[PDB]
Amino acid sequence: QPDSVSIPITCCFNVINRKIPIQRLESYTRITNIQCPKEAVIFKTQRGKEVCADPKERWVRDSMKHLDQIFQNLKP
Amino acid sequence: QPDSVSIPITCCFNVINRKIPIQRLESYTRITNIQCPKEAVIFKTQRGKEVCADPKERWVRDSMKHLDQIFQNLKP
């Protein structure tokens, strides 16, 4: 197989259970690899911590929306 | 005087008194003109509303920080 199949893959095996204050969240990425066990987002905090969260949770979608908006408005 | 002195100036005469949820706030600008009566920030919400706030308030500085970070990290 190509050497792309032996690249390591980052997953979320667990998702945070407490909501995190949105002013803490600075960015997010999505888990996309089918090898991973669950659909999830990884938030990057101000501090640089990485947090797995369930995009089905309300706060999570709301934080994702908030960051999306700004990103599309921040170009500048 | 130059025609710059007869340009209209936007100010904040009042500042919001209730805290606004940070996921609502998408951007901010500062009042800078000395003609204005008070130091303040103008937040732009998701919805496009404009809100005057007092940068001495905790939530406000925190929202400003949050947006600053992302802006400097969002270039991309």
From Swiss-Prot, chains A, B:
Transmembrane segments: none annotated. It comes from the Eukaryota. The modification Pyrrolidone carboxylic acid is found at residue 1. Disulfide bonds join 11-36, 12-52. This is C-C motif chemokine 8. It comes from Homo sapiens (Human). The chain holds residues 24 to 99 of 99 of the full protein.
